[PDB]
Amino acid sequence: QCVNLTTRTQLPPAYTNSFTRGVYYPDKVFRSSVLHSTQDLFLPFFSNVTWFHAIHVTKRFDNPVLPFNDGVYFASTEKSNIIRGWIFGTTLDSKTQSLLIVNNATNVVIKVCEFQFCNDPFLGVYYHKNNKSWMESEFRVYSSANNCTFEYVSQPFLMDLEGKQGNFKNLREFVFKNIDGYFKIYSKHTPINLVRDLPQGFSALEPLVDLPIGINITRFQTLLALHRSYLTPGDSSSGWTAGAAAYYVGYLQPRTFLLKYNENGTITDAVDCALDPLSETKCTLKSFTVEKGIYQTSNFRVQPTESIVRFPNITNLCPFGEVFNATRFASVYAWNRKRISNCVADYSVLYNSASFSTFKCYGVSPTKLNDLCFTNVYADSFVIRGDEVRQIAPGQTGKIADYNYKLPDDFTGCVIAWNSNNLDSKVGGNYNYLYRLFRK
Amino acid sequence: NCVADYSVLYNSASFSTFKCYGVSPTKLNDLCFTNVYADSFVIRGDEVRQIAPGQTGKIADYNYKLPDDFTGCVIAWNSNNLDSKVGGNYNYLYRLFRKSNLKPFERDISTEIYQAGSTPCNGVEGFNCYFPLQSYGFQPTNGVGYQPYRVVVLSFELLHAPATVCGPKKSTNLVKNKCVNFNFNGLTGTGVLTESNKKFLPFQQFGRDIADTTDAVRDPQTLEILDITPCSFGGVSVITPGTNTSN
Amino acid sequence: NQNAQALNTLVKQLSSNFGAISSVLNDILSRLDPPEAEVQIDRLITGRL
Amino acid sequence: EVQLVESGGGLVQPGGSLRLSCAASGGTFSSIGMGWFRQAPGKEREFVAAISWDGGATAYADSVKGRFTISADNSKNTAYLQMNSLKPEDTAVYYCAKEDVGKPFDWGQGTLVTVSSG
Amino acid sequence: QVAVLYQDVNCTEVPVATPTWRVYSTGSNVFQTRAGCLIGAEHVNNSYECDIPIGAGICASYQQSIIAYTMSLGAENSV
Ligand SMILES: *[C@@H]1O[C@H](CO)[C@@H](O[C@@H]2O[C@H](CO)[C@@H](O)[C@H](O)[C@H]2NC(C)=O)[C@H](O)[C@H]1NC(C)=O
Ligand SMILES: *[C@@H]1O[C@H](CO)[C@@H](O)[C@H](O)[C@H]1NC(C)=O
Ligand SMILES: *[C@@H]1O[C@H](CO)[C@@H](O)[C@H](O)[C@H]1NC(C)=O
Ligand SMILES: *[C@@H]1O[C@H](CO)[C@@H](O)[C@H](O)[C@H]1NC(C)=O
Ligand SMILES: *[C@@H]1O[C@H](CO)[C@@H](O)[C@H](O)[C@H]1NC(C)=O
Ligand SMILES: *[C@@H]1O[C@H](CO)[C@@H](O)[C@H](O)[C@H]1NC(C)=O
């Protein structure tokens, strides 16, 4: 079904510098002659972008993997239609569902399904003497299709059946983002011919599609099309048939951009915010022409590098268990009080109990109770029926809260309660606990 | 990609809890949203109060944490007639332990063995090394404290993006050149609409220079750019020669 | 210029929510019932004042 | 001295049943879970069963999967263990051990249980 | 080209608190004045007229680079 064909040749890496490209509309609204400043996940104007070259025309075969890292600014130029699509997947097997984006002449298919890929997946086309036509029946990229999740079919885009000879290279420049379960593919089709693949002329991108799919992909692959060629026996050459390609990949860093909208709604140009101090002045005045003078742009501060904390090494524990392991509790009319001081005591152990019916706290949220520390810790205890446990709280009334034990309105602490009918009840009733019912 | 008649939620009137957040409960059907997220699960009745913003405990801390900026409804009702099994139902599970509290709306599915104690057990259950999942065990005899409660959480999304979900409303013609607020498949138009041009790239929907001059009537069948302007508000003054001179 | 600047600030204060859920009052009216619409509108009123 | 009361240990025929109980009091009023271990003559200590004190989660060893039932009553503050299909190898001494938040597993004196047909 | 000016801080800790910003933070023509630590401007002993004002009798101007000097008081003559 599938044949494994690996290679030993590896190409060296290279890098270059982006100049101006990478500006897209950050919203679906229309603004004319406006200098709106938008904060978004853009890319810096002067950035380093990785440059890769595909199969070199004796022949060199390679297939690299590039990190995604919160979107990718992609640029490429091809004319032989060698690039058919991409496959995305952390493992690219039946363990997890895999994404396959394929563009062909008939249509474009985006399949999110579990596909069993090989070590070196590839796609091939051939020609039939009897059919007098070409077809693609070499589905060696995947072996089995199970656990189908998503299938999307769209009409082909950004492909023109134009036949010309000369330096008619066409530039394709996309931006990939994946946020909040939404995949956004911005693009700009601008045919520009120039010796260097990365031009200088400014351009503004537009949204193309939006896929409402949430998936995290770390490693991907870009496939290729192999055309079968009939050679004479004297040639004795076979095994690989493909073309050549190259592309640029850059990353996006979130920051603020002051963007100039043309009267037609397009973008004439834009200026970064943190590129240079002049750009900071240009952004802080929302203008492009700054007259001579001194402008206050922002503030600068020195950031701390480490945190310092110290406490005595004795760390003697205080009897938080004394007011919790106590066998007998005083009645509410004579509530017992226990002072806690000169100690260290965590409060996550109360969580480890998880046996409390009500752990409601006031003044200080107990998510990080142990973070701070206090002048004095007071432990009070009593026993009441679960009817009025709710009224032992700041600003509460009732006979229990008005005649026996009343919290202050500015109270700051936790209230802890549980059910213990096991330890303080007996057949015929337990009459040890008495509560005050009347008072002036 | 559909209209949502939320009035049927009140029509059933069989829901124990319906209290909503960040949007009017009764007149919910009168607006439109960028997207409608429907989350569904089943939990214990005594813990349904935990599915709410700013709530802490077991479920809201360890399985399904609702964000503070949540704008949507929360729904619950009894399920004994459909989810009670004699001898206890053990199909349902709820996570008991976590390394840390989940981020809002997160979805934790991993079944890695939890290390409750100080002795590492290299992902093998044993003493104080527990399987994080655990069954509810719905006894049909059990009272309202331990009943199986089905919960549906609707998470809306309000933005300026194309609203795919919308209320029923009605259908009638369109008028312009006279200031009037109305609706046309999700429009407000508090002002006078003119047959402007405002050449705009065929992907945008709204439009404003400072506050609002939106256009592009939201009808999928017909699109047209309609400027939005006020209808000549103005102060009024009075000239009087003097009450003791004339009238 | 100075006056323009001041005016250009004043209108720009309508886009700030001042702690409410929205910076426009029509959305508040269509969003919250009067019992909480009043409390959400009071923040906008005091900020704009 | 933390005292755990172990009851039910005694002689039992092969393929029988038993109900062992470990009762406790104290432990800073709050723990994380309770457990049962066993030690056979000529053999070291080994894990048998465990139940968390907060939830009903149960952990069983491979050699006792599906034939024991370990629960606990928080109100009674006592752990109960139900034994069925007593194999001859089960002859050992069983300990009830209480691990607490950052605390060892309270190791009681243990009780001897012998599986024989006599 | 520009020349940034910090507030009443010493020239030592400027680098501590993108490549262009790094170059400005490092600095090769550091000028220290009681108004602050202004950088990117050459200090010239002679005095010109006031063009762009900074604190404590300092003025910056453009001459193919930006220079910061002490502002002159006008042409001097004795009657
Ligand atoms: C269990 O509760 C007791 C309180 O009654 C804690 O402290 C005991 O206090 C009694 C009398 O004051 C004395 O016997 C000892 O000083 C303490 N220990 C014991 C075992 O009684 C006791 O610390 C609590 N248990 C734990 C584990 O903290
Ligand atoms: C702006 O639109 C007008 C309308 O016809 C057109 O003449 C002009 O060329 C456009 N300018 C740009 C920069 O697109
Ligand atoms: C920690 O505090 C104790 C107090 O007795 C003492 O050993 C010393 O001050 C500290 N220890 C060290 C190693 O400094
Ligand atoms: C208006 O004219 C009358 C007529 O002389 C005079 O008495 C009065 O004081 C005047 N003023 C007012 C306010 O009526
Ligand atoms: C800045 O620090 C240096 C380092 O010693 C010091 O000599 C100089 O006096 C300081 N500047 C001021 C204005 O104090
Ligand atoms: C200017 O002043 C500095 C500092 O005293 C001195 O080193 C230099 O020689 C003077 N002259 C010139 C031309 O820089």
DSSP letter string, C7-48: HHHHHHGGG--TTSS-SSHHHHHHHS-HHHHHHHHHHHHHHH
Alpha-carbon span B112 to B130, nearest angstrom: 9
Amino acid at A125: V
* Nearest ligand 3 atom to alpha carbon A312: 2
Alpha-carbon span A323 to A321, nearest angstrom: 5
Amino acid at D45: R
Q: Which of A324, A421, A422 sits opposite D28 (nearest CB)?
A: A324
Closest residue on chain D to A353 (Cα):
D30
CA of A73 to the centre of ligand 5 (A): 46
Q: How far is CA B177 from the centre of its chain?
A: 36
Q: What is the DSSP letter of B184?
A: S
Alpha-carbon span A18 to B159, nearest angstrom: 33
Q: Is A328 on the interface with D (CB under 8 A)?
A: no
Write the CB contacts of A18 (distance below 8 Å, at least 6 apart in sequence). A43, A45, A46, A47, A48, A49, A73, A198, A248, A250
Q: Indicate the helix (H) or strand (E) that contains B151.
A: strand B148-155
Beta strand B227-229 with B114-115 is unpaired
Alpha-carbon span D105 to D70, nearest angstrom: 17
Phi, psi (degrees; rounded to nearest 5) at C47? -65, -45
Alpha-carbon span D16 to D113, nearest angstrom: 12
Cα–Cα separations (whole angstroms), residue D41 to D15, D62, D92, D115: 20, 20, 6, 13
Alpha-carbon span A424 to A422, nearest angstrom: 6
Alpha-carbon span E67 to E48, nearest angstrom: 10
Alpha-carbon span D98 to D72, nearest angstrom: 13
Residue labelled with tokens 């051990």: D97
> For ligand 3, atom 5, which residue shows the shortest CA distance?
A314
Alpha-carbon span C30 to A220, nearest angstrom: 46
> Rounded to 5 degrees, what angle do the CA atoms B156, B160, B165 make?
45
Alpha-carbon span A31 to A39, nearest angstrom: 16
Cα–Cα separations (whole angstroms), residue B242 to B235, B239, B245: 21, 9, 5
Contact C27, C37 (CB under 8 A): no
Alpha-carbon span B209 to A35, nearest angstrom: 10
Beta strand A14-18 with B192-194 is unpaired
**Inter-chain touch B204–A265, beta carbons under 8 Å:** yes
Closest residue on chain D to B113 (Cα):
D59
Amino acid at D42: G
Q: What is the DSSP letter of A352?
A: H
Burial of B58 (0-12, 13-18, 19+ CB in 10 A): middle
Alpha-carbon span A16 to D76, nearest angstrom: 73
Amino acid at A213: I
Neighbouring C-beta atoms of residue B221, cutoff 10 Å: 6
Ordered strands of the A255-261 beta sheet: A37-40, A255-261, A267-271
Alpha-carbon span A403 to A392, nearest angstrom: 12
Here the tokens at position A127 are 């020609």
Among candidate residues B47, B9, B52, B28, the one with its CA nearest the CA of residue B150: B47
Among candidate residues D28, D75, B209, the one with its CA nearest the CA of residue A31: B209
Q: Closest ligand to E45 CA? A: 6
Q: Indicate the helix (H) or strand (E) that contains B10.
A: helix B7-12
Write the CB contacts of E25 (distance below 8 Å, at least 6 apart in sequence). E14, E15
Instruction: Measure in Å the smallest separation between the Cα of A327 and chain D Cα atoms.
Output: 9
Contact A284, A272 (CB under 8 A): no
- What b/e sequence results for D53-82 when a residue is b if at least 16 CB atoms lie within 10 Å of its CB, and e otherwise? bbeebbbbbeebeeebebebeeeebbbbbe
Here the tokens at position A431 are 């009459």
Here the tokens at position A338 are 């226990």
Here the tokens at position A64 are 């690299």
Q: Indicate the helix (H) or strand (E) that contains A279.
A: helix A277-284
Write the CB contacts of A216 (distance below 8 Å, at least 6 apart in sequence). A90, A178
**Inter-chain touch A29–B198, beta carbons under 8 Å:** no
Neighbouring C-beta atoms of residue A132, cutoff 10 Å: 7
**Inter-chain touch B31–C12, beta carbons under 8 Å:** no
User: What number of H helices and E strands is found in chain A?
Assistant: 3, 23
Here the tokens at position D74 are 């928080």
Name the method of structure determination: cryo-EM
Here the tokens at position A299 are 């503030």
Q: Among positive and negative, which fits the CA dihedral A229, A235, A241, A246? A: negative
**Inter-chain touch A29–B207, beta carbons under 8 Å:** yes
Alpha-carbon span B52 to D45, nearest angstrom: 47
Burial of A224 (0-12, 13-18, 19+ CB in 10 A): buried
Write the CB contacts of A51 (distance below 8 Å, at least 6 apart in sequence). A14, A15, A16, A246, A247, A248
Query: What string of DSSP letters covers D52-101?
Result: ESSS--EEE-GGGTTTEEEEEETTTTEEEEEEES--GGG-EEEEEEEEET
Among candidate residues A91, A31, A51, the one with its CA nearest the CA of residue A266: A31
Q: Is A296 on the interface with E (CB under 8 A)?
A: no
Here the tokens at position A312 are 């005595």
Q: Among positive and negative, which fits the CA dihedral A188, A189, A193, A195? A: positive
Contact A135, A183 (CB under 8 A): no
Alpha-carbon span B194 to B191, nearest angstrom: 10
Contact A318, A300 (CB under 8 A): no
Alpha-carbon span A11 to A54, nearest angstrom: 9
Q: Among positive and negative, which fits the CA dihedral D45, D49, D52, D57? A: positive
Here the tokens at position A194 are 């120039």
Q: Which long-range contacts (CB under 8 A, 24 or more apart) does E11-20 make?
A: E11/E37, E13/A302, E14/E39, E16/A302, E17/A300, E17/A301, E17/A302, E17/A303, E18/A44, E18/A46, E18/A274, E18/A275, E19/A46, E20/A275, E20/A276
SS3 assignment, position A152: strand
Residue window 45-84, chain D: list those with CB within 8 Å of chain A.
Answer: 53-55, 74-77
SS3 assignment, position B247: coil
Among candidate residues B89, B94, B63, B66, the one with its CA nearest the CA of residue B147: B89
Q: How far is CA A387 from the centre of its chain?
A: 48
Q: Is D33 on the interface with B (CB under 8 A)?
A: yes
Alpha-carbon span A247 to A55, nearest angstrom: 12
Contact A223, A123 (CB under 8 A): yes
SS3 assignment, position B243: coil
Residue labelled with tokens 């809306």: B156
**Inter-chain touch A30–B162, beta carbons under 8 Å:** no
Chain breaks in chain C (C to N over 2.5 A) after: none
Write the CB contacts of A306 (distance below 8 Å, at least 6 apart in sequence). none
Contact D27, D98 (CB under 8 A): yes
Cα–Cα separations (whole angstroms), residue A403 to A373, A395, A416, A418, E33: 32, 14, 20, 22, 72
Alpha-carbon span A296 to A282, nearest angstrom: 11
Beta strand A225-227 with A123-128 is parallel
Extract the runs of DSSP E, i.e. beta strands, from chain B. 20-21, 37-44, 72-78, 114-115, 129-130, 148-155, 192-194, 227-229
Query: What count of residues does chain E have?
Result: 79
Burial of A92 (0-12, 13-18, 19+ CB in 10 A): buried
Which chains would you list as touching B if contact means 3+ CB atom pairs under 8 Å?
A, C, D
- What b/e sequence results for E8-47 when a residue is b if at least 16 CB atoms lie within 10 Å of its CB, and e otherwise? eeebeebeeeeeeeeebeebeeebebebbbbbbbeeeeee
SS3 assignment, position A434: coil
Write the CB contacts of A159 (distance below 8 Å, at least 6 apart in sequence). A103, A105
**Inter-chain touch D30–A348, beta carbons under 8 Å:** no
Which chains would you list as touching D if contact means 3+ CB atom pairs under 8 Å?
A, B
- What b/e sequence results for C11-27 when a residue is b if at least 16 CB atoms lie within 10 Å of its CB, and e otherwise? eeeeeeeeebbebbbee
Contact B68, B54 (CB under 8 A): yes
**Inter-chain touch D57–B96, beta carbons under 8 Å:** yes
Q: How far is CA A48 from the centre of its chain?
A: 22
Neighbouring C-beta atoms of residue B147, cutoff 10 Å: 21
> For ligand 2, atom 7, which residue shows the shortest CA distance?
A264
Which residue intervals of chain E are DSSP H helices?
19-26
> For ligand 5, atom 5, which residue shows the shortest CA distance?
E12
Q: Give the torsion through C-alpha atoms of B46, B49, B54, B58, to 10 deg.
A: 30
Q: How far is CA C14 from the centre of its chain?
A: 5
Q: Indicate the helix (H) or strand (E) that contains B12.
A: helix B7-12
SS3 assignment, position A353: helix
Here the tokens at position B63 are 């399985």
Which residue intervals of A300-414 are DSSP H helices?
348-353, 399-403
> Rounded to 5 degrees, what angle do the CA atoms B171, B175, B178 make?
140
Alpha-carbon span A205 to A23, nearest angstrom: 6
Among candidate residues E3, E65, E69, the one with its CA nearest the CA of residue E40: E3
Q: Among positive and negative, which fits the CA dihedral A362, A367, A369, A372? A: negative
Among candidate residues D90, D111, D96, D91, the one with its CA nearest the CA of residue D27: D96
- Residue D3 Cβ inside 6 Å of ligand 1? The answer reads no
CA of E10 to the centre of ligand 5 (A): 6
Q: Is C41 on the interface with B (CB under 8 A)?
A: no
Amino acid at B247: N
Neighbouring C-beta atoms of residue B85, cutoff 10 Å: 13
Burial of A131 (0-12, 13-18, 19+ CB in 10 A): exposed
Phi, psi (degrees; rounded to nearest 5) at E20? -65, -40
Q: Is A356 on the interface with D (CB under 8 A)?
A: no
Q: Do chains E and B touch (3 or more CB pairs under 8 A)?
A: no
Here the tokens at position B84 are 């009670």
> Rounded to 5 degrees, what angle do the CA atoms A150, A153, A154 make?
135
Q: What is the DSSP letter of D41?
A: T
Alpha-carbon span A354 to A352, nearest angstrom: 6
Contact E34, E55 (CB under 8 A): yes
Chain breaks in chain A (C to N over 2.5 A) after: 57
Strand partners, D6: D22
Q: Is B168 on the interface with D (CB under 8 A)?
A: no
Alpha-carbon span D44 to D39, nearest angstrom: 6
Among candidate residues A302, A43, A77, the one with its CA nearest the CA of residue A189: A77
Contact E38, E5 (CB under 8 A): yes
Q: What is the DSSP letter of A342?
A: S
Phi, psi (degrees; rounded to nearest 5) at A187? -155, 160
Which chains would you list as touching E if contact means 3+ CB atom pairs under 8 Å?
A
Q: Which long-range contacts (CB under 8 A, 24 or more apart) does B223-226 make?
A: B224/B195, B225/B196, B225/B197, B225/B198, B225/B200, B226/B176, B226/B189, B226/B193, B226/B194, B226/B195, B226/B196
Ordered strands of the D68-73 beta sheet: D4-7, D17-24, D78-84, D68-73
Contact D50, D56 (CB under 8 A): no
Strand partners, B74: B153
SS3 assignment, position A95: coil
Among candidate residues A64, A200, A300, A74, the one with its CA nearest the CA of residue E21: A300
Query: What string of DSSP letters covers A175-186?
Result: EEEEETTEEEEE
Here the tokens at position A95 are 């363990």
Q: Give the torsion through C-alpha atoms of D62, D65, D69, D75, to 10 deg.
A: 50
Q: Among positive and negative, which fits the CA dihedral C36, C40, C46, C48? A: negative
Here the tokens at position B238 are 């009075």
Q: Closest ligand to E36 CA? A: 5
Q: Closest ligand to E43 CA? A: 6
A367: left (phi over 0), alpha (psi -120 to 50) or beta: alpha
Contact A421, A430 (CB under 8 A): no
Mutate to test the pocket of ligand 2, among B197, B198, B199 (most ligand atoms within 8 A of CB): B199
Query: What count of residues does chain D have?
Result: 118
Contact A245, A22 (CB under 8 A): no
> For ligand 2, atom 6, which residue shows the shortest CA distance?
A264
Strand partners, A48: A17
Strand partners, E70: E58
Q: Is D100 on the interface with B (CB under 8 A)?
A: no
